[PDB]
């Protein structure tokens, strides 16, 4: 008949800052169609909808863009995560998704959850081998480091900068990007603990993203393979600055890259709208 | 501190038919920086504002896309009236804009706006002179009627199809269209009272729109210039067939085209949803 939703700025503490996605509770009731297209109406990059369980798990997560269902997503599950987490007390949540049972951890003051952390799929690589297009098509001669793709449901190849500065100067080609299929571009720059980043995907309908979540993970392994951090050691990926939409992504990857144990991205998030919708 | 808005769906009578506009109410406290970050945050093609009257209208209303503000949209201003409708129970309300105060007349039943007449700017118009760069894109050979653009605010381009199903098949290269600055391609087919319409725009951010309001009075001086109709004689225009969002437009332009005198376009609107944010 009706269905509460909430609006969550994912990966920011303030309001309209961070990627937004919406939320929307008690959603049993609605086919898949349904679900399509109220994600076509909302027009956010993702909405998702909380569904019973059906593997033992707390809830069921379907994810979708304006055109069509993910198997998974980062900054989306991120924010339900944190959006559940004002109807339950649990200090862990369990979401089932396509791809199986990903566990969250929840941080709260005063009942309020203000943060969560996630394991995330563990990602698959090779080169890209598409070196000089992509670079023609950013603009620039070459990257620092390899220019490898990674697969976690989404694709995200990474090119390096040598300075932030470097990377803010950016101004992609994007018809020329958009030869790339089914892939974001996820260009970084940083030193030590601390990295920014700008993810631009035709693929997936975005210009430039504000925070690309399943994309924190697989930057920690690269980082880590290219001996720029350890394994085991967390890092802060600050992404979207340049069009206005700072996002603070935290991840880690355990384990060797021939054996990776466990990878974590977390971040805040924030409500930045509350409602209902009509059926 | 807060902020009530609604989502209506505009030239719609059921939920997800229609093209959605956001309606933000008592927004006096807004800059207009942070009403286009709350634009950018909703991506909708458009959130509106609802501001104290400068001029003697009811209200002053500003239009933003995610990236811009507006002086002038159909749609947008439809959804609006209707939304307004709900806190006053006057029968005409007239909403101030950038090209000043625009007049709607409010149908209602038991209280509720279920409908809404404005006038439009009247337009200006002339031959594209791009036919066959148009036409290729497009994926036809040729036009029924002349290839005209006209100027209202934004700039509507007409091509005329010789049947509906014609207009149903076409698949246009929405690359070449890009080429097409500043403007939106209308193709329309029909006869006598009933006409079919799909609007594409690279320039104004829509691969296909739903429900393109500042087109229905051009095509209906279209229409009436080239034979179709008579000025004065309404026309019910339903464009978005193909795409999943129909949506009903009615347009009539009185006068001559040396004289036009009056432009009206009307629909049907229905809230989609209702709620709150947190700025
Ligand atoms: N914003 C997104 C858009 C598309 C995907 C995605 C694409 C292909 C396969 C797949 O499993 C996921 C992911 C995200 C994300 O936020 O992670
Ligand atoms: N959806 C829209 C997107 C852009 C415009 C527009 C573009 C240039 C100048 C201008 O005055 C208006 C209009 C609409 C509309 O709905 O009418």
Redesign the pocket.
Same mark, same amino acid.
């Not at 993910?70 to 989306?76: E, S």
């Given at each position: 008949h009706m269905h509460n939703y909430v609006i969550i700025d994912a990966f920011a503490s303030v309001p309209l800052e961070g990627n937004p996605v919406a939320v929307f509770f008690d959603a049993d009731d609605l086919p898949p169609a349904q679900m399509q297209r109220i994600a076509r109406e909302m027009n956010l #990059?993702?909405s998702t909808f909380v569904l019973k369980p059906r593997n033992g798990g707390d809830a069921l997560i379907r994810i979708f863009?304006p055109v069509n269902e993910? +198997?998974?997503? %980062?900054? +989306?599950l991120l924010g339900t995560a944190i959006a559940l987490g004002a109807h339950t007390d649990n200090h862990r949540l369990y979401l089932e998704t396509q791809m199986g049972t990903i566990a969250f951890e929840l941080e709260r003051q005063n009942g309020s959850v203000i943060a969560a952390s996630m394991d995330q799929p563990i990602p698959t690589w090779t080169a890209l081998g598409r070196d000089a297009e992509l670079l023609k098509a950013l603009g620039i001669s070459d990257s620092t480091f390899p220019i490898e793709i990674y697969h976690n %449901? +989404?694709?995200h190849v990474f090119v390096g900068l040598p300075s932030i500065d470097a990377l803010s100067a950016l101004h992609p080609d994007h018809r020329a990007l958009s030869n790339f299929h $089914?892939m974001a571009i996820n260009c970084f720059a940083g030193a030590g603990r601390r990295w920014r980043s700008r993810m631009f995907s035709p693929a997936?309908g975005?210009v430039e $993203?504000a925070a690309? %979540? #399943?994309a924190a993970g697989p930057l920690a392994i690269h980082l880590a393979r290219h001996g720029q951090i350890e394994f085991g050691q967390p890092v802060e990926i600050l992404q979207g600055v340049e069009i206005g939409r700072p996002s603070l992504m935290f991840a880690k990857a355990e384990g060797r890259a021939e054996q990776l144990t466990r990878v974590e991205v977390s971040g805040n998030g924030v409500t930045f709208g509350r409602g209902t919708i009509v059926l």
């Open positions: #990059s993702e863009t993910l +198997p998974f997503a %980062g900054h +989306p %449901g +989404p694709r $089914d997936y975005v $993203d690309t %979540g #399943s």
